Amino acid sequence: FGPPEFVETPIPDVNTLALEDIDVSNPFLYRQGQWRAYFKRLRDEAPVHYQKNSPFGPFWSVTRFEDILFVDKSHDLFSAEPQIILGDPPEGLSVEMFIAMDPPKHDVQRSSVQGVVAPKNLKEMEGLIRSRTGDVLDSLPTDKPFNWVPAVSKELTGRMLATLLDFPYEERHKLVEWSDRMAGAASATGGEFADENAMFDDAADMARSFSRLWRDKEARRAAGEEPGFDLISLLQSNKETKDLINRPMEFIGNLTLLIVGGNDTTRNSMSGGLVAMNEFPREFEKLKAKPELIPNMVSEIIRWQTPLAYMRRIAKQDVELGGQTIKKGDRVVMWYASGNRDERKFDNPDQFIIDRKDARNHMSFGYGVHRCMGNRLAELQLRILWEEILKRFDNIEVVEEPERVQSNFARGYSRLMVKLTPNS
Numbered sequence: 417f418g419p420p421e422f423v424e425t426p427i428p429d430v431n432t433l434a435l436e437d438i439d440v441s442n443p444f445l446y447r448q449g450q451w452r453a454y455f456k457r458l459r460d461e462a463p464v465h466y467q468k469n470s471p472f473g474p475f476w477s478v479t480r481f482e483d484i485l486f487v488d489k490s491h492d493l494f495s496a497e498p499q500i501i502l503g504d505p506p507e508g509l510s511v512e513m514f515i516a517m518d519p520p521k522h523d524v525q526r527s528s529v530q531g532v533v534a535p536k537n538l539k540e541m542e543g544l545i546r547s548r549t550g551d552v553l554d555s556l557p558t559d560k561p562f563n564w565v566p567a568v569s570k571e572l573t574g575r576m577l578a579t580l581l582d583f584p585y586e587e588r589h590k591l592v593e594w595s596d597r598m599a600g601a602a603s604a605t606g607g608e609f610a611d612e613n614a615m616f617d618d619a620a621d622m623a624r625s626f627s628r629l630w631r632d633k634e635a636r637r638a639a640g641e642e643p644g645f646d647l648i649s650l651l652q653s654n655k656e657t658k659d660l661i662n663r664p665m666e667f668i669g670n671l672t673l674l675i676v677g678g679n680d681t682t683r684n685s686m687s688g689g690l691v692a693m694n695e696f697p698r699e700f701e702k703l704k705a706k707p708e709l710i711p712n713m714v715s716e717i718i719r720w721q722t723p724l725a726y727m728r729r730i731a732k733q734d735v736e737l738g739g740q741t742i743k744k745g746d747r748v749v750m751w752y753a754s755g756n757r758d759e760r761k762f763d764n765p766d767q768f769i770i771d772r773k774d775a776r777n778h779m780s781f782g783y784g785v786h787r788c789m790g791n792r793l794a795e796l797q798l799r800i801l802w803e804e805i806l807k808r809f810d811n812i813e814v815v816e817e818p819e820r821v822q823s824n825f826a827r828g829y830s831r832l833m834v835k836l837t838p839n840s
């Protein structure tokens with residue numbers, strides 16, 4: 417009812433702009449290394465900022481750590497419904513996910529899946545995660561450079577996603593392709609996926625594949641296969657969700673949220689730690705001399721990378737924030753990527769400091785009722801990755817400037833060319 421194009425051009429210095437003309441929805445800001453200066457000007461001089469004009473329509477940017485905490489925690493004032501990316505999904509491809517729901521329904525839906533990351537289950541999966549990590553690292557050449565993104569970050573992420581859903585291992589690349597094309601929709605995040613035809617094909621292949629999986633698993637259960645750790649087994653084991661297939665919106669929304677949830681977040685945290693080490697190489701010497709730093713370092717990698725730059729909200733009513741009046745119905749973008757660089761919260765915020773004692777207080781997982789469900793699984797994979805790196809490699813060299821992904825939402829890497837030096 418009723419009545420887009422992204423081509424990269426050089427982004428000017430933020431000092432050339434009127435404050436009202438600063439548009440941080442531009443999906444090339446991370447790639448061009450202008451994002452830090454743009455968010456700093458907002459934090460300093462317009463921390464609750466209204467952009468009247470953008471390809472996504474108008475929106476507020478909330479850029480200080482303390483103000484983002486308030487917006488994220490205050491779901492009575494700032495709704496996550498109906499979407500949490502800045503723009504809109506293409507027509508015909510809106511799916512309800514509980515990341516874009518408010519309590520109480522949010523809490524009900526999250527409760528139906530949260531067992532898949534139960535701490536007892538993560539512990540039992542440590543052997544498999546570590547095996548995959550070591551096998552992947554042992555397979556890498558040490559006599560020439562290679563692209564870390566496909567060989568390590570995407571490889572490990574795809575196996576993890578297959579495990580979460582007990583998805584056919586040989587088809588696991590499909591979970592990643594489907595997640596990429598959803599999160600990368602041009603109309604939603606300024607990503608490079610602008611062919612609505614391929615999105616319609618995916619959305620239908622995926623729904624057909626999840627239904628086959630559900631039916632295969634219920635047929636396998638009916639034939640006596642013992643239930644496992646995966647999401648489908650858990651849903652089919654609980655009275656509330658044993659019939660979830662008959663609720664197509666809930667069924668597709670829960671399965672897709674789990675796959676998108678861990679797809680480029682994992683991947684880009686795995687890559688981003690190497691980039692941060694490359695910029696701050698003394699931290700790798702510190703790590704080798706004190707390997708017990710790995711858990712805190714994992715938090716600092718996640719803070720410094722901030723794999724998801726924001727989550728969006730809609731004001732439920734007029735709200736005074738930062739000396740501005742956000743109007744009812746306005747979109748409000750919580751820029752975690754800015755909050756984690758806010759010097760009001762973190763001293764020397766742009767430095768990667770792997771023993772930073774407050775690194776765990778970052779906002780890369782958000783805060784409030786939507787605080788990332790997969791946080792401990794993300795931390796676990798990163799811990800095991802770095803433990804297995806330290807066993808094998810005395811040095812890691814980045815041999816070319818990394819290529820960064822076009823998106824205003826995912827902060828990530830498509831090319832990361834690495835040369836390994838094995839230890840003695």
Ligand code: HEM
Binds near residue numbers: 723
């Ligand atoms: C370093 C890795 C990750 C980062 C930075 C990250 C980031 C986030 C963020 C920012 C949110 C929303 C927070 C908010 O609105 O307040 C979120 C929610 C969520 N994440 Fe993650 N995520 C990561 C890994 C994962 C993994 C591995 C999974 C699944 C295994 C996952 C599943 C989810 C789900 C299901 C939600 C929705 C939670 C809710 O709405 O209650 N995430 N994540």
Ligand SMILES: O=C(O)CCCCCCCCCCCO
Binds near residue numbers: 501677
């Ligand atoms: O399908 C829709 O309706 C819109 C989906 C937009 C993309 C959803 C992105 C969710 C990323 C969650 C990552 C959590 O760790």
